[PDB]
CSV table of C-alpha atoms and ligand atoms in Angstrom, one decimal:
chain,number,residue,atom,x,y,z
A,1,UNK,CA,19.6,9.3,12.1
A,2,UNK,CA,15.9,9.7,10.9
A,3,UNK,CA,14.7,11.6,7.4
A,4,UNK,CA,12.4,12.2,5.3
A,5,UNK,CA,12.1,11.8,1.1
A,6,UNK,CA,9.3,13.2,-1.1
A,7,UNK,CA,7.2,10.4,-2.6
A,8,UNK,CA,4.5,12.0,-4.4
A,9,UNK,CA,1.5,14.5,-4.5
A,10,UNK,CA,-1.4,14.3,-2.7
A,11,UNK,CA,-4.7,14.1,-5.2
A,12,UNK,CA,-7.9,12.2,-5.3
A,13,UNK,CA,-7.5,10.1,-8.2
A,14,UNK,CA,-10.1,9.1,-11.3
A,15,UNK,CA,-9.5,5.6,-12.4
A,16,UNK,CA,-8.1,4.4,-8.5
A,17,UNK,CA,-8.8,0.7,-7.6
A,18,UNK,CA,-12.0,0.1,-6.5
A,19,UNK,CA,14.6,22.2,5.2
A,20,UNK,CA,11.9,21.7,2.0
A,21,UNK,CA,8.5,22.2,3.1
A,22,UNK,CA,7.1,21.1,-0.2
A,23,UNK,CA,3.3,20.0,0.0
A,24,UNK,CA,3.2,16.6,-0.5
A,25,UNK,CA,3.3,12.7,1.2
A,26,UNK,CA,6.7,11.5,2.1
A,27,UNK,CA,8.4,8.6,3.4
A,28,UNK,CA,9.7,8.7,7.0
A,29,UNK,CA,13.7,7.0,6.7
A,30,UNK,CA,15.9,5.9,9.6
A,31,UNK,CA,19.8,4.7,8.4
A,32,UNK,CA,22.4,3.4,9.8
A,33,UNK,CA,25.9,1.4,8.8
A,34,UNK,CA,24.2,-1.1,7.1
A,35,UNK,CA,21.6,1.7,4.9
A,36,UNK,CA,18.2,3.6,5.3
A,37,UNK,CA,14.6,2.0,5.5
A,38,UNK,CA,11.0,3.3,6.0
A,39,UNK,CA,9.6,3.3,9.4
A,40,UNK,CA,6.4,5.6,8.2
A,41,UNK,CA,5.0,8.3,6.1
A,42,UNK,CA,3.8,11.8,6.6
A,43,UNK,CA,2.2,14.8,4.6
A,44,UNK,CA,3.4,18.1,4.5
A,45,UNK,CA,0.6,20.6,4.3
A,46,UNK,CA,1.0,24.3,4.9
A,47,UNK,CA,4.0,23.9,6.2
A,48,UNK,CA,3.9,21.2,8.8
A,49,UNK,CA,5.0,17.8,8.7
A,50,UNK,CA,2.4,15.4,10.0
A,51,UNK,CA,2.5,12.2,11.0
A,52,UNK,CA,1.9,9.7,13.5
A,53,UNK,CA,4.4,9.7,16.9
A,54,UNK,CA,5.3,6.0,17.1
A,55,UNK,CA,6.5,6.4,13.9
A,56,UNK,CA,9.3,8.9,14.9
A,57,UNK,CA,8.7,8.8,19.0
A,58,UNK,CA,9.2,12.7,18.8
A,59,UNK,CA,12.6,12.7,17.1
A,60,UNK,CA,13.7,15.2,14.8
A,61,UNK,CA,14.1,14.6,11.1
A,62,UNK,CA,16.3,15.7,8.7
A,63,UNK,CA,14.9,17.2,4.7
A,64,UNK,CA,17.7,17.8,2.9
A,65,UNK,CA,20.2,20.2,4.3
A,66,UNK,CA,18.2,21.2,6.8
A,67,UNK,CA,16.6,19.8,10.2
A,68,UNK,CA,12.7,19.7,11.0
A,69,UNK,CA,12.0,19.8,14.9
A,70,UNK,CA,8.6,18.4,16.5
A,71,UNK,CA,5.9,21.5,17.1
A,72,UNK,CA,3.6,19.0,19.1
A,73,UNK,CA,2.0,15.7,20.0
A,74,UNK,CA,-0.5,13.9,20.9
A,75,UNK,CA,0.8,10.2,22.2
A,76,UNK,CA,-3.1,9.3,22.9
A,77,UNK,CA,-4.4,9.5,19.2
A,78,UNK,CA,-0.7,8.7,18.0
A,79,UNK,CA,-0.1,11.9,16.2
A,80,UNK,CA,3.1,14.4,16.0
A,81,UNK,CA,3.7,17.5,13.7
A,82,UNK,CA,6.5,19.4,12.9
A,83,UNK,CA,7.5,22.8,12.6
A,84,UNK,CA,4.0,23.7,13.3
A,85,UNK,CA,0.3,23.1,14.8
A,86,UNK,CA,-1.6,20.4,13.5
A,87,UNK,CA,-3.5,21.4,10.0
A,88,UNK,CA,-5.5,18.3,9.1
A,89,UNK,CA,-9.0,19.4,10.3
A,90,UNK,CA,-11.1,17.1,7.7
A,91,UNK,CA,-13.0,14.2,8.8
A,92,UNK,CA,-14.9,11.5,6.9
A,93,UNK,CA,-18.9,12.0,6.4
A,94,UNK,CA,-19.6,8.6,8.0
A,95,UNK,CA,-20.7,7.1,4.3
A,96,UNK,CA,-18.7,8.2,1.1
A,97,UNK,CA,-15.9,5.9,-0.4
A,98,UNK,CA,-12.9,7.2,0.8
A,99,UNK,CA,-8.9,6.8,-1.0
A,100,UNK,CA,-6.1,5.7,0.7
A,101,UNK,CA,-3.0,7.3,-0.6
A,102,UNK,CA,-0.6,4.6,0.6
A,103,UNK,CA,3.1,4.3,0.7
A,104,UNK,CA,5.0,1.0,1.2
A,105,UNK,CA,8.4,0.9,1.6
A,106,UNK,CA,10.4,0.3,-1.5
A,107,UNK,CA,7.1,0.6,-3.5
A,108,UNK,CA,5.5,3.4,-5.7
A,109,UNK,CA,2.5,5.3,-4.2
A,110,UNK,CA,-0.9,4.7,-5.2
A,111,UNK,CA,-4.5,5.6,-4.6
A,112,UNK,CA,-7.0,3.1,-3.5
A,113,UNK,CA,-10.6,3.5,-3.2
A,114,UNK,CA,-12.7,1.9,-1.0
A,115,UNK,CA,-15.4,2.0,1.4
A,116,UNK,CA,-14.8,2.4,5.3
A,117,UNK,CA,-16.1,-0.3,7.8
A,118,UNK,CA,-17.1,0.6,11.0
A,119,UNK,CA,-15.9,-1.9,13.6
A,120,UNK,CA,-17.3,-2.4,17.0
A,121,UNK,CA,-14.6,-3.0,19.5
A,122,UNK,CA,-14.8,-2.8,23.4
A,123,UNK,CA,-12.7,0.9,23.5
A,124,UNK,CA,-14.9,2.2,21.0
A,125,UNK,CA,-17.3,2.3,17.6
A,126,UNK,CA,-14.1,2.6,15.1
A,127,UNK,CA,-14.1,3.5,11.0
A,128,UNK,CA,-10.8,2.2,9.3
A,129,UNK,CA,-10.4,0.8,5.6
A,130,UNK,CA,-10.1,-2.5,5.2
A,131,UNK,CA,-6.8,-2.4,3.5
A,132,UNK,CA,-3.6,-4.3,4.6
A,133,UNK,CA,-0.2,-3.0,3.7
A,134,UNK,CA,3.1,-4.0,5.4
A,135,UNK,CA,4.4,-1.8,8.5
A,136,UNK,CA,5.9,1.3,7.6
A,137,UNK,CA,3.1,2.0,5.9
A,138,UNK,CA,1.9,3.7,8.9
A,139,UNK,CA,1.2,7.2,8.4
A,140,UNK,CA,-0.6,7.4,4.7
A,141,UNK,CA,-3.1,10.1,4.2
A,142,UNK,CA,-6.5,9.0,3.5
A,143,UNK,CA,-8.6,11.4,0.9
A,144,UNK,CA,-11.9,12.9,0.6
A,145,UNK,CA,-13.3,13.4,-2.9
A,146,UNK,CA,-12.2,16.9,-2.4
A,147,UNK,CA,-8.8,15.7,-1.7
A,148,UNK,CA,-8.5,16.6,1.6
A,149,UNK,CA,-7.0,14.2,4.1
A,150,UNK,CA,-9.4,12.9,6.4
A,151,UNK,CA,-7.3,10.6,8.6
A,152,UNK,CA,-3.7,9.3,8.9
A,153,UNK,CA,-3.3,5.2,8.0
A,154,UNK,CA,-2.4,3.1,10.6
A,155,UNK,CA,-5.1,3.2,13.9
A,156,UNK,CA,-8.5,4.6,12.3
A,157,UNK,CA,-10.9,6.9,13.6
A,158,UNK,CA,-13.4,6.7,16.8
A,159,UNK,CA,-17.0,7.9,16.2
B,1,UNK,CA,-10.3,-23.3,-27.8
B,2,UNK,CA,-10.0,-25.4,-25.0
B,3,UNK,CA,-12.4,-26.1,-22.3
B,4,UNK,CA,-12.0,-27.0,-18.2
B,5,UNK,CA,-13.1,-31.0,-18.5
B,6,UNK,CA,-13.4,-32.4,-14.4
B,7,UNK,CA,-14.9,-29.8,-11.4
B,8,UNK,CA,-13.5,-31.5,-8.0
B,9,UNK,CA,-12.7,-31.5,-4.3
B,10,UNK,CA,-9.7,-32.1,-2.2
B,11,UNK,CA,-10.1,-32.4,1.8
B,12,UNK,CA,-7.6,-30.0,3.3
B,13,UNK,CA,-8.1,-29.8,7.1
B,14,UNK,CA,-10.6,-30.5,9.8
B,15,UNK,CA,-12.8,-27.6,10.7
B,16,UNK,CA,-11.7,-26.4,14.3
B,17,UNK,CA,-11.3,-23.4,16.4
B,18,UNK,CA,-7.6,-22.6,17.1
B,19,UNK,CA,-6.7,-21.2,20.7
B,20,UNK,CA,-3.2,-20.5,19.1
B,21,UNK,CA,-4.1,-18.2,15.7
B,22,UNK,CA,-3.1,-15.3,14.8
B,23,UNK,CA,-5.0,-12.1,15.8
B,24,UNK,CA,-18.4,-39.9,-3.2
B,25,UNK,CA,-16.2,-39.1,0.0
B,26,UNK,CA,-18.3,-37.0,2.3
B,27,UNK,CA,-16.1,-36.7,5.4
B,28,UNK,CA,-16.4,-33.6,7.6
B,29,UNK,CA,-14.1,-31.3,7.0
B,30,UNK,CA,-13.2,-27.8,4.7
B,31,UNK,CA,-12.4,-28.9,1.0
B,32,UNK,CA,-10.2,-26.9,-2.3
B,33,UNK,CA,-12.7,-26.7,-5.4
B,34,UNK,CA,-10.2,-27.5,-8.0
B,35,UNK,CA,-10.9,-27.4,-12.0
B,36,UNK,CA,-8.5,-29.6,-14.1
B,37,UNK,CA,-7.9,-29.1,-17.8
B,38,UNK,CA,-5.5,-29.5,-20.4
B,39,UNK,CA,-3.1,-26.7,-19.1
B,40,UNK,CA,-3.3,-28.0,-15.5
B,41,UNK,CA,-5.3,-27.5,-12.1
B,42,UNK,CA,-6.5,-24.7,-10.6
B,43,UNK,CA,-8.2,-23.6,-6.9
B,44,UNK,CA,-11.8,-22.3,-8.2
B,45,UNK,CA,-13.0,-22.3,-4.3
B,46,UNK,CA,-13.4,-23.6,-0.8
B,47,UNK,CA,-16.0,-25.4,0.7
B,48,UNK,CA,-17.3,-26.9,3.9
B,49,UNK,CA,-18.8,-30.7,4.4
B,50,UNK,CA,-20.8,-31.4,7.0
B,51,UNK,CA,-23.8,-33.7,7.8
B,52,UNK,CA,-23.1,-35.7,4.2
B,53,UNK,CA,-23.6,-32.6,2.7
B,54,UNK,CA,-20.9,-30.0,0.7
B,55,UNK,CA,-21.3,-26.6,1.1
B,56,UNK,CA,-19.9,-24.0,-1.3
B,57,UNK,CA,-20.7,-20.9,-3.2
B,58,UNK,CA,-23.2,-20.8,-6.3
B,59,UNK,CA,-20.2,-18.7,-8.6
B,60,UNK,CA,-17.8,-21.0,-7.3
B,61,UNK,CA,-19.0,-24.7,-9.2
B,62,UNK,CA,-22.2,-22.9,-10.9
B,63,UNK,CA,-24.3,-26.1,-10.0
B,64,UNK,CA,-21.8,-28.0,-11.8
B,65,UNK,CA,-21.6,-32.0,-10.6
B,66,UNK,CA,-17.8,-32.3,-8.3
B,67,UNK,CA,-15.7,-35.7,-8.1
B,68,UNK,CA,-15.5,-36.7,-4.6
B,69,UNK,CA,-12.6,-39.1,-5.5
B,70,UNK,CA,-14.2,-41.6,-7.6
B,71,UNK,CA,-17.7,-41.0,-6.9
B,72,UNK,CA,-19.6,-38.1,-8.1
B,73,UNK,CA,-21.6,-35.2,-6.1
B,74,UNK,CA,-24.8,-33.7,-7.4
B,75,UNK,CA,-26.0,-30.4,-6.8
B,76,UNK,CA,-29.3,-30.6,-4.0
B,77,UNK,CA,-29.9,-26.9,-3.6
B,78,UNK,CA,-28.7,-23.5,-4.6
B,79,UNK,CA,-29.7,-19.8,-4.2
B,80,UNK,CA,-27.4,-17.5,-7.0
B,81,UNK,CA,-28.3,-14.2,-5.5
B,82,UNK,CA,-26.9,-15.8,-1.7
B,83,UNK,CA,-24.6,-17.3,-4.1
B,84,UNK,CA,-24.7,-20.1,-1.9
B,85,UNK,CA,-24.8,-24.3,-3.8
B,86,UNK,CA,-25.6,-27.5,-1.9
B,87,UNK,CA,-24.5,-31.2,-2.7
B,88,UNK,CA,-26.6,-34.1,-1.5
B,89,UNK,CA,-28.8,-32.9,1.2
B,90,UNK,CA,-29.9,-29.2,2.0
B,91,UNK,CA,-28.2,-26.5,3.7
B,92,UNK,CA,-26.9,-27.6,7.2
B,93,UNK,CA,-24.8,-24.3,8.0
B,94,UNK,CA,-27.5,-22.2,10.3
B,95,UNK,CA,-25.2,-20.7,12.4
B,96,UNK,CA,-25.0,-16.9,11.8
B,97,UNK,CA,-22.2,-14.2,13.9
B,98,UNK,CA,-23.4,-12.5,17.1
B,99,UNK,CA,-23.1,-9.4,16.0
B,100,UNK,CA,-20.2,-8.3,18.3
B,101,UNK,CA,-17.4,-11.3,18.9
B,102,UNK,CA,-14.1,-11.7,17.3
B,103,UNK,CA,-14.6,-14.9,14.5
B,104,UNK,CA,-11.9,-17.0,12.9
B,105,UNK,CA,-11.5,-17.0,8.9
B,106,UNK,CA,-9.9,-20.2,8.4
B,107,UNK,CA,-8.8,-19.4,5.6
B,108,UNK,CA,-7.6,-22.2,2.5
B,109,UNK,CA,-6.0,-20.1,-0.4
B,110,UNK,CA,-4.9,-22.1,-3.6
B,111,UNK,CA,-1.3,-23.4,-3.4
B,112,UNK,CA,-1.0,-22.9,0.4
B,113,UNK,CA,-1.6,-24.3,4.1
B,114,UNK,CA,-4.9,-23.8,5.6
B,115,UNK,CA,-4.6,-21.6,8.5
B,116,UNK,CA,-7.1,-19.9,10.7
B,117,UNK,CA,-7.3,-16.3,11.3
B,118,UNK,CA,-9.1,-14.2,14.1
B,119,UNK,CA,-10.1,-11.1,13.4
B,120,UNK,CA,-13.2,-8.4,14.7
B,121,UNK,CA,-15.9,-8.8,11.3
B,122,UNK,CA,-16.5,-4.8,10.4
B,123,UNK,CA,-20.1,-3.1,9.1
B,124,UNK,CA,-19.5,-1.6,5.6
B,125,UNK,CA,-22.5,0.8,5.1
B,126,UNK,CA,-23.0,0.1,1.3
B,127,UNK,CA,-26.1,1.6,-0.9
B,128,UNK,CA,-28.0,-1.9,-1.0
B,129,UNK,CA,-27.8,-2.6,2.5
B,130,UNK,CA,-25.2,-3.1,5.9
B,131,UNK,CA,-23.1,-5.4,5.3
B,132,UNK,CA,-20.6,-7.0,7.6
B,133,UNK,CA,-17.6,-8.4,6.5
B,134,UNK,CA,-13.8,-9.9,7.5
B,135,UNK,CA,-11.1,-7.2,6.9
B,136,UNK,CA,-8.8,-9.9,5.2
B,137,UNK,CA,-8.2,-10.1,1.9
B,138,UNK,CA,-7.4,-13.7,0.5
B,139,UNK,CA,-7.3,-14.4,-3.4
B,140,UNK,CA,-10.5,-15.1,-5.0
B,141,UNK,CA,-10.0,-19.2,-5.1
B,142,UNK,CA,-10.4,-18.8,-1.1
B,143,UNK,CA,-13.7,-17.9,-1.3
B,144,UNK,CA,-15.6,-20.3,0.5
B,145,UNK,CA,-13.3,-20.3,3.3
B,146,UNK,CA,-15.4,-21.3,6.3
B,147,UNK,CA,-15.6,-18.2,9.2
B,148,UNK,CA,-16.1,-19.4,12.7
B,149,UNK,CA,-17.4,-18.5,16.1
B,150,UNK,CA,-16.1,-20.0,19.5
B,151,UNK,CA,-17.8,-22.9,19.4
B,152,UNK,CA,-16.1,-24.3,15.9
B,153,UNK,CA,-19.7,-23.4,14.0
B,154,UNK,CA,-19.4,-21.9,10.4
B,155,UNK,CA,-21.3,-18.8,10.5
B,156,UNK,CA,-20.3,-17.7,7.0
B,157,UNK,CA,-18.3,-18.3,3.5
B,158,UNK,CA,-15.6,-16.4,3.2
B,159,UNK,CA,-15.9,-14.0,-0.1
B,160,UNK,CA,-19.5,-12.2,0.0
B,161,UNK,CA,-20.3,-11.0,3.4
B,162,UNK,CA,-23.7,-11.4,5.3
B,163,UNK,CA,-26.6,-8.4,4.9
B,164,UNK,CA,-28.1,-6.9,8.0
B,165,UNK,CA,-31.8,-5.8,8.7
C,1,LIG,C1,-9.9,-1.0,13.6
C,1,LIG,C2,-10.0,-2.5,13.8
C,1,LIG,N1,-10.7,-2.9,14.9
C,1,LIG,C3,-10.8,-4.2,15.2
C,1,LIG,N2,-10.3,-5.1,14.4
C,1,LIG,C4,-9.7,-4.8,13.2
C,1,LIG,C5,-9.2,-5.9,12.4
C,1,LIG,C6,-9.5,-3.4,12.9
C,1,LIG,C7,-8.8,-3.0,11.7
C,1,LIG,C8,-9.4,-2.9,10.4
C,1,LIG,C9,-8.6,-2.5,9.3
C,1,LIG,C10,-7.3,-2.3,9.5
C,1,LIG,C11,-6.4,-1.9,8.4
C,1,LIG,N3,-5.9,-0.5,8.7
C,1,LIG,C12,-6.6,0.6,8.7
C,1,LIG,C13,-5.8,1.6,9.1
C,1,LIG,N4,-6.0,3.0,9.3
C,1,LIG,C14,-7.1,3.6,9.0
C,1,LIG,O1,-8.1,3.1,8.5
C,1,LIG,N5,-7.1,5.0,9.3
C,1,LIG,C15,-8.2,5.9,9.1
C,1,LIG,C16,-8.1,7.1,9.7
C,1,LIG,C17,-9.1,8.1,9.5
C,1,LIG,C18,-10.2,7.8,8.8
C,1,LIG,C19,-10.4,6.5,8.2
C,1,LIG,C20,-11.6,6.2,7.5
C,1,LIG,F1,-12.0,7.2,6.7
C,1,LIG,F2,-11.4,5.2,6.6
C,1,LIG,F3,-12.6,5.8,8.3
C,1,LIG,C21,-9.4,5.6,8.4
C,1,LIG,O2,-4.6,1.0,9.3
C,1,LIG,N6,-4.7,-0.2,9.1
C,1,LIG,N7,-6.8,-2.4,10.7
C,1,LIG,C22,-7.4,-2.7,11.8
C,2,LIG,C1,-18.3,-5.8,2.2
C,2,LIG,C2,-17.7,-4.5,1.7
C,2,LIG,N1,-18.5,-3.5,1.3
C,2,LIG,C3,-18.0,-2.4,0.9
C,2,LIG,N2,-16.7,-2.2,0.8
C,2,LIG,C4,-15.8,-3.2,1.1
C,2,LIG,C5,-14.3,-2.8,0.9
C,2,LIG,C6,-16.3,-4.4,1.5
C,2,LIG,C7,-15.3,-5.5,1.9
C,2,LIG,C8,-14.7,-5.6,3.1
C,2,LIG,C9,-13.8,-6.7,3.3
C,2,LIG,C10,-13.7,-7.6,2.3
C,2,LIG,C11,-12.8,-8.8,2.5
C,2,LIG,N3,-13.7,-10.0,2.4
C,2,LIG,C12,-14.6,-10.4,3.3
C,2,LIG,C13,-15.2,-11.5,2.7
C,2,LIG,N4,-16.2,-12.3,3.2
C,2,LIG,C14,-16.7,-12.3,4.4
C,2,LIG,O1,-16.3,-11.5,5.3
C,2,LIG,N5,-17.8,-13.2,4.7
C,2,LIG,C15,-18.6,-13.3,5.9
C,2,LIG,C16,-19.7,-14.2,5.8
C,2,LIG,C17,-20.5,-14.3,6.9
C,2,LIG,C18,-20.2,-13.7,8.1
C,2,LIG,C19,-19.1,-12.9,8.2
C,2,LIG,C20,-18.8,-12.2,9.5
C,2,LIG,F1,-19.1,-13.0,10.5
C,2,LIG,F2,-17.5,-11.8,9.5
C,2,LIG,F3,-19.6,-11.1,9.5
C,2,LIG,C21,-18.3,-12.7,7.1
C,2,LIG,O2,-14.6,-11.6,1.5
C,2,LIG,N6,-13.7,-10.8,1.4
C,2,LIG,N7,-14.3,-7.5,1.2
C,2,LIG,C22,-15.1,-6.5,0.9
């Protein structure tokens, strides 16, 4: 039994560290006997749930009263929208300070801005912020200065 | 008020590559900077002895003198924009990273085990220049915190980064 819970708005925000459909970011539950915990976090946008398929493996996810079914995947980058297509289209520019909007579990959102580093593995040339956070964290947008979200946290981006 | 009165060091561990991690007394080995006062002690840095000579960062002792026990350790050399200080001899540490291999942090943070942590170094484009840098965050008393390749060399202090041209 998997669900999800609104956590916050989605904004680029001055003075960062350097079933509803509401827009918004929201944690990604599972519960059992013993009680609920966070196994990711999505954005709704337009619509359409996003987030990243290991987080839910395609399951569907109750908001509220009612029951959101996945639209489609994509197991390769890791990604998995619901009740429609896939409406994050932004990118980052390859060199502006970016904000992750993270959400740990059993913690308060929060912006944090910081500059991506591009890291050279064998698969590919990959951007990814050099933030930590624990695991079911996966899944927080990552901003643009105009507030758009540029990436999913959790694998980074190939260039 | 009151001031910080003795700078010294403390060995914590030899300074070795780990097949198993996760993915004055002048003795070899990495060292906690410690600052004792009135209030207590406190973990100012890391640094890294080798060849009778202590390596650290400039902001980390400031060219003070450290206790190496009971004897004492003068500053030799120091450059504050590199941010890098010397005691007793010059600069031994001319290893530098590859440019493309995992390295370890072994990392020292105040009140805690050393432990060594290997990790793929990442290129931040910043304004000044291309800088590449360990995605781990550590406290700031861990600066200092020797980085190693495969052969057990300290190619970098843990807290800066290292410019590319
Ligand atoms: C990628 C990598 N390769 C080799 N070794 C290491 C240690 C790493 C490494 C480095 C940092 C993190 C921490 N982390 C980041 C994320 N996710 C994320 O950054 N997503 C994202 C998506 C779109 C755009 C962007 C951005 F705009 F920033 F480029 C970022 O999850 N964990 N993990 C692994
Ligand atoms: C550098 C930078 N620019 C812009 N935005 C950000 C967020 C960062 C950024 C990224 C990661 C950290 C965490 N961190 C690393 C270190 N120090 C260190 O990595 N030193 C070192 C020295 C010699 C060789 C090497 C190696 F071989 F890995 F290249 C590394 O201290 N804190 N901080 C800041």
């Amino acid at each position: 039994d998997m669900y999800i819970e609104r956590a916050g708005d989605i904004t680029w925000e001055k003075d960062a560290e350097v079933g509803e459909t509401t827009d918004g970011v929201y944690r990604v539950m599972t519960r059992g006997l013993l009680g609920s915990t966070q196994v990711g976090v999505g954005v709704m946008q337009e619509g359409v749930f996003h987030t990243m398929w290991h987080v839910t493996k395609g399951s569907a996810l109750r908001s509220g009263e009612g029951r959101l079914d996945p639209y489609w995947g994509d197991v390769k980058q890791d990604l998995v929208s619901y009740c429609g297509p896939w409406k994050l289209d932004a990118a980052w520019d390859g060199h502006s300070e970016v904000q992750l909007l993270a959400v740990p579990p059993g913690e308060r959102a929060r912006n944090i801005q910081t500059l991506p580093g591009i890291f050279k593995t064998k698969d590919g040339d990959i951007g990814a912020v050099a933030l930590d956070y624990p695991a079911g964290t996966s899944g927080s947008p990552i901003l643009d200065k105009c507030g758009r979200v540029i990436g999913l946290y959790g694998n980074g981006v190939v260039i």
